[PDB]
Symmetry: C3
Subunit: 197 residues, 3 copies
Amino acid sequence: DNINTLWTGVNPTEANCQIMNSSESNDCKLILTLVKTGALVTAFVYVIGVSNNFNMLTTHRNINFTAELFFDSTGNLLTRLSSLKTPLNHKSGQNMATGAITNAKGFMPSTTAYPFNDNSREKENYIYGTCYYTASDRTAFPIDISVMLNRRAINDETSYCIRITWSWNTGDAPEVQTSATTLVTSPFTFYYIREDD
Amino acid sequence: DNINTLWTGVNPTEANCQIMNSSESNDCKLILTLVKTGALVTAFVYVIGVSNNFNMLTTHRNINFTAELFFDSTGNLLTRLSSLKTPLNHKSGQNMATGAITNAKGFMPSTTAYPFNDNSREKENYIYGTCYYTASDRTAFPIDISVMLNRRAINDETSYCIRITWSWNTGDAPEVQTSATTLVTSPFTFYYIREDD
Amino acid sequence: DNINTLWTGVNPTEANCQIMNSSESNDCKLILTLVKTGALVTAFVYVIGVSNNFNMLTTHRNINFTAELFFDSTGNLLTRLSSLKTPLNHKSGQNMATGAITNAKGFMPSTTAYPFNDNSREKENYIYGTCYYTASDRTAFPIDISVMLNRRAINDETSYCIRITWSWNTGDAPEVQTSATTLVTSPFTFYYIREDD
């Protein structure tokens, strides 16, 4: 059953993702778990902030950040182009397994269900939902999430795309500078029709 | 694993569903994927509009449309009574497999969890959530979704029912006539306790 | 596949849960289904009210009630400390199987992903979402749901914790005394990274 999961592992020691291009290094831990579920992938995702600049986004009224995930034709993460810098792997306890995936193409968003560059079908490339930031006062602050699958390639090397955008546009920021600690999002689970191996 | 999915296939060429009774033919593509997940079915559903009359619903402030899915005692779609006119089948790549289902009863909503004609238990027959229409300005327009399982049969032939209602009641329509194109809903995933085979 | 589910069974005859400490006995049926899905558990939960005092909560503007689920190191329900008084079991038709679980540890919330007593990681212990009460006028009344995993133990015996809180804080109650019947919540499905066996 371990091969039915493609994931980041649980709570890596170091930030594995540069979600802001304004950062000088990886600025958060992107926790991403993809599970093969029949014709679908169950996708489970959140961020644990690390860098101060990312963590202090909780003091802003308007925020938008995107984890751009690009994969080659074999379903392997293109780390040089992607926000996530650590390739995914199968489940091994609470950690990533060692070597070499590629039933991985089977975890990718279907190019039949989610096309590239098709303006007449562009609405089909989008998934939306809500996750939450737990504020210092323990209230659940709603964060809008938008997932775009495929749709726009960077180059001929990028055969699959998963772009996950967290955003909010509220009357007030969830924190002030004196109350802000770590930007963590609650797990968001979404589903998509998967490519075949 | 292909037999664990019962679905419509991906993006059929022609509309497979008459979701408005006001239409003169099938007016949209109902994409429906049911996956057996332990004691539950994971149900994944959305519509891709085809007919102009259905697509132009995006210019209305108040809209309601329901995909009524009726199945016989073996879990086979009663196409003559249902909004969906194309029987479901197992996964074969991105398409439907050929012949003959019926581990299909195992994909049906449980008559023990979701009874028929039981007013004292009627609240148990309902699932709710939210999906989204991607407007021409790329904003996510929230659409209310209500699923009623079993509860009300058409006749003695209809052993199982899945009624999926999309609706919105807003201060403004998501589109004007000059901006409206295709009514597509983002995938909605819901869960229910499944009947046994 | 029956062993991949840990659940309460469907619609037990008697209330199996004391969700209000103000009740004189079990006051509702907690329907809980946990399904192993790759590295995750798919958790499916709702309540069917039984006692009048619980059912009449629908006449209040502000309500909060929590199902506290505590498990020992083997993943078995500590009924003496928990809101749920009926141990979970595997799937057997629409009912619970007989004897003895414990691939059950594998259904528990990961202590690596969801730590105990770690203030610096506390935001990671929370999941949120929305479910709905179907009011007498058939409108869907939104109920806020908050799940806290692990985080706070009662004693050294409680190795795992799932605390599920339903709440609402609205301008008006969903019912009046003359219209109120049964407090039923629509199924809420959430996901978490699971402990290994």
